[PDB]
From a paper:
Omicron (B.1.1.529), the most heavily mutated SARS-CoV-2 variant so far, is highly resistant to neutralizing antibodies, raising concerns about the effectiveness of antibody therapies and vaccines. Omicron is the most heavily mutated variant to emerge so far, with more than 30 mutations in its spike (S) protein, 15 of which occur in the receptor binding domain (RBD). To delineate the structural basis for antibody-mediated neutralization, we determined the cryo-electron microscopy (cryo-EM) structure of a prefusion-stabilized Omicron S trimer in complex with representative Fab fragments. The two highly potent antibodies against Omicron (XGv347 and XGv289, with IC50 values of 0.006 and 0.016 μg ml−1, respectively), one monoclonal antibody (XGv282 with IC50 of 0.268 μg ml−1) with intermediate neutralizing activities against Omicron, but high neutralizing activities against the other four VOCs, and a monoclonal antibody (XGv265 with IC50 of 7.479 μg ml−1) with more than 500-fold decreased neutralization against Omicron, but potent neutralization against four other VOCs were selected for structural investigations.
By contrast, each of the complex structures for XGv289, XGv282 and XGv265 showed only one configuration, in which three XGv289 Fabs bound to two up and one down RBDs; three XGv282 Fabs bound to one up and two down RBDs; two XGv265 Fabs bound to an S trimer with one down and one up RBD, although the XGv265-bound up RBD conformation was weakly resolved and therefore not modelled. Overall XGv289, XGv282 and XGv265 bind patches surrounding the right shoulder of RBD with various orientations, but in a manner similar to those observed for LY-CoV1404, BD-812 and REGN10987—antibodies that are known to generally neutralize most VOCs with high potency—but showing decreased, to varying degrees, binding and neutralizing activities against Omicron owing to the presence of new N440K and G446S mutations. Consistent with XGv289, the substitution of G446S alters the hydrophobic microenvironment generally established by RBD and a group of antibodies bound at the right shoulder, including XGv289 and XGv282, triggering a conformational shift on CDRs and disrupting antibody recognition. In addition, the mutation E484A breaks the hydrogen bond with R74 from XGv282 HCDR2 and losses of charge interactions between R346 and K444 on WT RBD, and D56 and D58 on XGv265 LCDR2 owing to conformational alterations, further decreasing the binding of XGv282 and XGv265 to the Omicron S, respectively. Among these four representative antibodies, XGv282 showed a minimal reduction in binding affinity (fivefold), but a more substantial reduction in neutralization (approximately 40-fold), whereas XGv347 showed a 40-fold decrease in binding, but unchanged neutralization against Omicron when compared to WT S, suggesting that the epitopes, rather than binding affinity, might have more crucial roles in the neutralizing potency and breadth of an antibody.
Author numbering:
A (entry chain G): 345 to 589
B (entry chain D): 441 to 489
C (entry chain K), D (entry chain H): 2 to 119
E (entry chain N), F (entry chain L): 1 to 111
G (entry chain E): 14 to 68, 75 to 240
Write the structure that this text describes.
Amino acid sequence: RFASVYAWNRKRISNCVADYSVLYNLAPFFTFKCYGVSPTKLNDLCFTNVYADSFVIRGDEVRQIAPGQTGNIADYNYKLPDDFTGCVIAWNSNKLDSKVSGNYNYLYRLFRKSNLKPFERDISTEIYQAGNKPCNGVAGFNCYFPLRSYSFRPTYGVGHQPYRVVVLSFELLHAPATVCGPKKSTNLVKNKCVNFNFNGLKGTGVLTESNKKFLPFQQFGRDIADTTDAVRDPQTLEILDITPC
Amino acid sequence: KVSGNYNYLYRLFRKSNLKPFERDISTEIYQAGNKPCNGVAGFNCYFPL
Amino acid sequence: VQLVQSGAEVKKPGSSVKVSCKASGDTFSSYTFSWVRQAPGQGLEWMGRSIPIVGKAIYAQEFQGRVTISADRSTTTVYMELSSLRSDDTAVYYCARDQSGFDFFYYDHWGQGTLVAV
Amino acid sequence: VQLVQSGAEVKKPGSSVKVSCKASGDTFSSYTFSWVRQAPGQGLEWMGRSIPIVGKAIYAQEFQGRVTISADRSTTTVYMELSSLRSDDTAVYYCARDQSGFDFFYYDHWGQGTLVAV
Amino acid sequence: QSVLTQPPSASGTPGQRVTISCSGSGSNIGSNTINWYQQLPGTAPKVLIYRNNERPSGVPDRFSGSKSGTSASLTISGLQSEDEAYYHCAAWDDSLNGPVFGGGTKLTVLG
Amino acid sequence: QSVLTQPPSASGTPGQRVTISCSGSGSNIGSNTINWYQQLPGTAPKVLIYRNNERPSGVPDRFSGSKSGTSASLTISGLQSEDEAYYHCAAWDDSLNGPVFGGGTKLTVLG
Amino acid sequence: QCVNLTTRTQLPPAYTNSFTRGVYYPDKVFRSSVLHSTQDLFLPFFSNVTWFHVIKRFDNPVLPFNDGVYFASIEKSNIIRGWIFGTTLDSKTQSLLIVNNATNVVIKVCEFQFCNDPFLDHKNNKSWMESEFRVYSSANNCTFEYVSQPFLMDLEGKQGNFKNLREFVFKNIDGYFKIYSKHTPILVREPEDLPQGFSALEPLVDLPIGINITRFQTLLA
Ligand SMILES: *[C@@H]1O[C@H](CO)[C@@H](O[C@@H]2O[C@H](CO)[C@@H](O)[C@H](O)[C@H]2NC(C)=O)[C@H](O)[C@H]1NC(C)=O
Ligand SMILES: *[C@@H]1O[C@H](CO)[C@@H](O)[C@H](O)[C@H]1NC(C)=O
Ligand SMILES: *[C@@H]1O[C@H](CO)[C@@H](O)[C@H](O)[C@H]1NC(C)=O
Ligand SMILES: *[C@@H]1O[C@H](CO)[C@@H](O)[C@H](O)[C@H]1NC(C)=O
Ligand SMILES: *[C@@H]1O[C@H](CO)[C@@H](O)[C@H](O)[C@H]1NC(C)=O
């Protein structure tokens, strides 16, 4: 179950490596267009903070999710900044979210005093007074409930099905990175002149078994000439021995 | 113009970088997903323009 | 789920009947108590459902809005007033759970019921 | 610039309509047809605007879907498919060349039209 | 009065498989699911079967159900004396836009 | 239904000058020029006045149009036999991000 | 929950001559049989260090923080639990939380409204027990969360034979809080002053906390 559109939740993504393969693998993911960054290169970047907003919207309201879009849901329930960085993913959930009888779960704003700024939070659902005279107590004349329940029935046509949407908003390396893309996988080669790039430590030479001992903390060995000569393989704790060709 | 020009295009997806002064042009679909695709734009492969 | 219901009531035509169905063991703000009436020695007859929030309620074609329902999330009670009464209104009124998945439609667990004789 | 649309089409409501207009003696890649709805003896109404390259298109603000675009440059033809037909769909499709400026916007000419009865 | 029609009484010996039939309309039974509910005399009606294939309460395995077009069948096997109860068939219809219930079958068990 | 409010019908004898007024909004008429289209009955629509100051293909200079605020008026001085036509207003709209159209006004030739 | 204990007894601070302690591994680098000159933050040899003894004692003074500190505690009961690197402790400025009660080492910077003087000391009179886990009241906007394995602790509180000596050095450079640690449960003598000899300080962990720190408090049981 995802949070309501008016009750969108902001999930923290940090201190982890985000693999977008499964994000890029699931078939029903159709509306996947990204603006700030290329969608195919999220798996090799470092981001200090990422936000997740999961909710379900109707098909006739998908167009209002793009940044700077103005409409009904985009003005009274949830709005995106004009300089939004990231993108969103929309996929069908008619079989799952919509009951056989049809769910009436999601409530969206109808009447609001003024438009809402992007990423603002509002939870109060006080009734809206239509007329000049304020209305208090119960709903009635000159005051109607500003919330309407979504009707997602199996007999509804295309565009009226529950389409789950997750919003991915993040910065672009503006702080100590907490979310980084997975690093490329290559196999170790021993006793061969290679252009090794251990954790970014570029170099060239042949690597053999090293009888030198590293403490569990120590990572790189240095010689009198003040250059690297031994590296610890991330996959295998065995210590290599860098020497030029 | 008032109606909104769209004649100018620019690539987004490519196999790799290109050397300076590359003067060749393709409308071929770009395969980004592991599974190969052919014909028109589909899943895991989208138009690079 | 326990569906506490009001006692049996007898009321003349046009007097109107107020039936209360109580909630226990669960918050009432996101759950609905759909209402159906069964004629004694006869099948169930659908009446409708009410949502505690917003206040929108679905009724049946026969009622044409003659019945009203009030449901407040704090009181955790569904109140049904028939308004119009007749000999056919003599029935046992049963309130039922609505399965799960925000728990709105279908009838999952009926209440003890209240017999109204007109 | 001559645009040749399909003939009179009669379709059952809730069905799908396939209608195409052809490009003749012109650069179809540098020409676009923005389809316009036209009720007989009534005001025009824009449906959509597309481009042959890439295939990007924009549809009516009122309808998120309803009508799907397709364009074939080899046959220099534009195809429009309408779904969930209703009685209000009894009207004509007029296409439209797009003035100047590589012909991606504005209206200059129209195809003979395609009358559809639903 | 009910859109769905049920027999007025069903009788059978204990331990015998008894079938309860319900007839409606294509837009009522033939379009979506049918549901069988068992009400004990004087108690709250309890959902015996739902979605035409499974049981909501984990009711015993002897209470099976099937839906063929506008017809609904509820087959009960290993009949017991406590099974004598009201059986009701209900379905959602778009013509009335909601649930509608049947006339009820009074399953009775003899000696 | 049309955002641009055109009269539904109009009349005019040959030789006289008649105006047809279409009104919209400031985002589509006050912020954009209006385009006047003519359409002989039974035939494809053409373009009569565009950019409010020019004719697309040497169209009779007797035709004219004016725009002020959120209103536009087509004035033609030279009514003639085949001037019976439907006349439409078209303008881009940022709120709808699309070409909003008028309801169409029929100019007839009186006897 | 905390209590305004007050009734604080205080003694004048002591001073000791730090002979040699306070040398760590300068970086993530291994070298063998060489002499290396490094310009970094250190503790000068034969320096002056402040000595605090807590018995009938309620002494948790706020310590002026400045670009890395050296903290060496000799004990057996493991009264010293952790530290809080918070400038206001009023739940408007994000505050550090360095606590390892039994096995969870919770690290978080968040708006914390702590008590008058957060003590975990008071629970069930003389009998020792963990207490006052509710040092703060609310945590509204917490950015960083971290958990790790516990250090070498001591169960409950044991008086006498302070074999344990835990020596740490803290620094915060380029938004990275680095802690360099050593744990020697080897003090065969009465406590008195600091011992003599060398001790390598292996770095323990580094976290990208980022926030500036100017003062803090030492959390003890
Ligand atoms: C000559 O240059 C052209 C472009 O300047 C090359 O065409 C590209 O070939 C690659 C590899 O097949 C494609 O991925 C590109 O899409 C092509 N560009 C265009 C615009 O189609 C061509 O391969 C080069 N030929 C040689 C022999 O190097
Ligand atoms: C102690 O009392 C002061 C003054 O009332 C108050 O500000 C503070 O929060 C109290 N602290 C505790 C631990 O109750
Ligand atoms: C600093 O250390 C010297 C060394 O004995 C000592 O005499 C002096 O009192 C110390 N100063 C302070 C302020 O502790
Ligand atoms: C540490 O957390 C674990 C898991 O919640 C818990 O079992 C353990 O008791 C905690 N340590 C404490 C509270 O001493
Ligand atoms: C020990 O602490 C508990 C919890 O605060 C309290 O209920 C109990 O009375 C205390 N007992 C003693 C011995 O003080």
